[PDB]
Amino acid sequence: MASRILLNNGAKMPILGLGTWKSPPGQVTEAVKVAIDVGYRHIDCAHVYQNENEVGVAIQEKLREQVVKREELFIVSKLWCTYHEKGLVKGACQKTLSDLKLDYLDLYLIHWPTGFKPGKEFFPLDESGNVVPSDTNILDTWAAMEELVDEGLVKAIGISNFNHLQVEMILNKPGLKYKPAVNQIECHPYLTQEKLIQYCQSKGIVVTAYSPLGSPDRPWAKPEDPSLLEDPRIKAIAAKHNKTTAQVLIRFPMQRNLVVIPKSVTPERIAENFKVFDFELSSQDMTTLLSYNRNWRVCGGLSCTSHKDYPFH
Ligand SMILES: NC(=O)c1ccc[n+]([C@@H]2O[C@H](COP(=O)([O-])OP(=O)(O)OC[C@H]3O[C@@H](n4cnc5c(N)ncnc54)[C@H](OP(=O)(O)O)[C@@H]3O)[C@@H](O)[C@H]2O)c1
């Protein structure tokens, strides 16, 4: 298992990264410092997470310490839905760059295919509770992303939470200049995504699997929900390999040629989650894990289900 995957922009991306959604601002600086100290070279970020300044403190301190060189890091962020306007994309990217302490991003993603009315609120609502859309379509947002490459702000551009038809719409864009490098989607044994993964990979788009552990800290978790980390069938595969259940859940997408971005702010778990390059799941293990699919989503985008570009109908 090589540590990096080749993207369609010619750059290499580490297949394991650290997630930062829900990482508290008072804990994420140490989390990222620990991650870099124990070997992580890829950090997954977003403006909507409200913690990029604190992530950036860690990155900048490890660069200053010469623990790593900038060229050895792969930093990802995402354009939030309220910035799908031609005239707002550059400033949104620059705010992320300034918060992260960087002069370029390795990868910048359209966070969701749904554009919302610009303003201070990340989910602008009508008086009846529906998100207020923007009329800017995703192809015009893509053209704005392409400009960022041509201005040197980002090395690669991609998409997130795009369905098969939405990926195809960009690939078929008249005058397309840069193909998406990555589609970042939810993926784990309860949402195995065979169809969408096959399509993206067949087009040379690398897939990143988010919520690989089933996001046990998601804010809307309910006791009756299925739990990957507590599934006895997955625990049994882990026991057979003398690994933890989390380590199996991280290795699983790696063996599907995916990038994977488990989140932790716990130093011991950050280290545990990196120790996944020294064992191999069998083909039978892989097929068994795939068999657990039930089309269950952590991230249903429930605050934007009324938007015309909602991806999960
Ligand atoms: N593009 C998108 O729309 C999108 C959506 C969702 C997620 N993402 C990205 O994907 C990342 C990962 O997804 P996620 O944050 O939803 O969840 P996740 O990585 O599936 O799970 C994170 C949870 O698992 C716990 N955990 C981590 N390692 C563990 C271990 N070894 N043993 C036991 N528990 C462990 C963490 O606890 P502690 O932190 O307390 O240790 C946290 O509660 C996000 O942080 C974000 O970067 C992107």
From Swiss-Prot:
GO terms for biological process: C21-steroid hormone biosynthetic process; carbohydrate metabolic process; cellular hyperosmotic salinity response; daunorubicin metabolic process; doxorubicin metabolic process; epithelial cell maturation; fructose biosynthetic process; metanephric collecting duct development. It is an enzyme of class 1 (oxidoreductase). Gene3D superfamilies: NADP-dependent oxidoreductase domain. Keywords: Acetylation, Cytoplasm, Lipid metabolism, NADP, Oxidoreductase, Phosphoprotein. Pfam families: Aldo_ket_red. Its EC number is 1.1.1.21, 1.1.1.300, 1.1.1.372, 1.1.1.54. GO terms for cellular component: cytosol; extracellular exosome; extracellular space; mitochondrion; nucleoplasm. It is found in: Cytoplasm. Transmembrane segments: none annotated. The modification Phosphoserine is found at S3. Changing Y49F: Complete loss of glyceraldehyde oxidoreductase activity. Substrate binds at H111. The record marks K78 as: Lowers pKa of active site Tyr. Cys-299 may regulate the kinetic and inhibition properties of the enzyme, but does not participate in catalysis. Tolrestat inhibits retinal reduction. The modification N6-acetyllysine is found at K95, K222, K263. CDD domains: AKR_AKR1B1-19. The modification N-acetylalanine is found at A2. It catalyses: an alditol + NADP(+) = an aldose + NADPH + H(+); all-trans-retinol + NADP(+) = all-trans-retinal + NADPH + H(+); 9-cis-retinol + NADP(+) = 9-cis-retinal + NADPH + H(+); 13-cis-retinol + NADP(+) = 13-cis-retinal + NADPH + H(+). Highly expressed in embryonic epithelial cells (EUE) in response to osmotic stress. It comes from the Eukaryota. GO terms for molecular function: aldose reductase (NADPH) activity; all-trans-retinol dehydrogenase (NADP+) activity; allyl-alcohol dehydrogenase activity; electron transfer activity; glyceraldehyde oxidoreductase activity; glycerol dehydrogenase (NADP+) activity; L-glucuronate reductase activity; prostaglandin H2 endoperoxidase reductase activity. Belongs to the aldo/keto reductase family. Monomer. This is Aldo-keto reductase family 1 member B1. It comes from Homo sapiens.
